[PDB]
Every structure is written in C-alpha cells, then in structure tokens.
Amino acid sequence: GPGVTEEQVHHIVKQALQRYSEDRIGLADYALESGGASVISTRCSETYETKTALLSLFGIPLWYHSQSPRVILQPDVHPGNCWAFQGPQGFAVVRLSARIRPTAVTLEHVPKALSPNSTISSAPKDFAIFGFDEDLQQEGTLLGKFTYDQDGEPIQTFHFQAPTMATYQVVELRILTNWGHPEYTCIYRFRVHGEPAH
C-alpha cells in the first residue's frame, strides 16, 4: 500500500543479514581451502613479499610468515591478507574441492576506504580463467576473460558467457594487468562457483 510498515522493514533487514552471513553472496565456493580446495604451489607465480621496507627497516617478527598463494583460498580479507606477486602479471592454479561445471568466479579486493589514500592500485584488473580437464595439466582452455573494476564493489562476481557443459577440477586464475602499481599485484580472495555431480 502506502510506504512500508516497521514490521516489513524488520523482515527485509533480517533477510538481508541472513544473505550477508552466507559468505555474502550465497554461492558455494569450490575453491575454498577449508572446503578441500588447494593451490598447486608448483603451478603459481612466485610470491612477492610486500612488507620488505618494514621487514628490513624494522625486523622479521618471530611469528611472521610470508603470505603464500593459499591465502587466495581463505576467507579473511582484512588489509594485508592477500597474496602478492611481482609486477602486473601472475597466475595461480587451483585444484577445486570437487569436479564441477564452472558457471562463475568471484574476485574481491580490500575496499578503498580501508587503504592508504583510498587507492588500490595493486588490485588485479584484467584477468582470465582456464580449466584443465586432466591432472597432468599442460593445456588450458579459456573459460572467460574479465576485468576487476577498481571503482566497483569490493566483491565482484563474473559469470561465464554460455559455458560448455565441460567439467573441471583444476582451474587457473591468470592476472593480465593490475590497476597500475609498479611493483606488485595483491590478490585477496578468489572463488569458483558451478554445478557439481548428481
């Protein structure tokens, strides 16, 4: 009718929070490390230490460990909890927790509001996703190319345009450019969504 009652607001809020709590976007993530996914270390850009100027000019904390490629499969995305590689090109290969037909990926970066100077120049920009249908993964099939938009929302999801029904258990994230940081690109979290067996 006219406007909205206090009661329907409560319902809209409760539902929005329930969606928020389903890993924000409500899609199963077959790349999530705790769900059984892993990175193929041997098939990943070399890790770049972003905290150099502090690891030298102040020390190596005793509990301190470099952010490795598995970090992209981990949901903590507080500032710094990103895997960094050198320069604007890099890739990681992920073995998914199940064989799936892939329909979408998600990439997120730390929000501008939480970065120095509100810029995120080390965020990835253009990237592509490849599926490897065999384990002895030499030949990649392009599943899609996309751009992470630095003026968009921190979490962005990308739907493959008309996928085949091919299924895959190993996928690569291949970063083609960044948002212009001259030293490295930082990846906060990469997710892979699709349809499993049965």
CA dist list (Å): 195 to 35, 45, 56, 59, 172: 15, 28, 46, 47, 18
Query: Cβ distance 93 to 137 under 8 Å?
Result: yes
Site string for K ion, 43-82 (x = CB under 5 A): ----------------------------x--x--x---x-
180 belongs to the binding site for a copy of itself (CB under 8 A): no
> Residues 6 or more apart from 86 whose CB is under 8 A from it?
45, 46, 48, 183, 184
Q: How far apart are CA 149 and CA 125, in angstroms?
A: 7
Q: Which of 83-91, 114-122, 160-168, 181-189 is the region at the interface with a copy of itself (rule: CB under 8 A)? A: 114-122
4 belongs to the binding site for a copy of itself (CB under 8 A): yes
Q: Kindly tell me which residue out of 141, 142, 164, 196 binds a copy of itself, with binding defined by CB under 8 A.
A: 196
165 belongs to the binding site for a copy of itself (CB under 8 A): no
Distance of CA 76 to the CA centre of its chain: 11
CB closer to a copy of itself out of 58 and 138: 58
66 belongs to the binding site for a copy of itself (CB under 8 A): no
Shortest spacing between CB 145 and a copy of itself, in angstroms: 27
> Residues 6 or more apart from 83 whose CB is under 8 A from it?
47, 67, 68, 69, 70, 71, 72, 92, 186, 187
Q: How far apart are CA 46 and CA 25, in angstroms?
A: 30
125 belongs to the binding site for K ion (CB under 5 A): no
79 binds, among a copy of itself, K ion, none (CB under 5 to 8 A by kind): a copy of itself
Query: Residues interacting with K ion, by CB under 5 A?
Result: 71, 74, 77, 81, 189
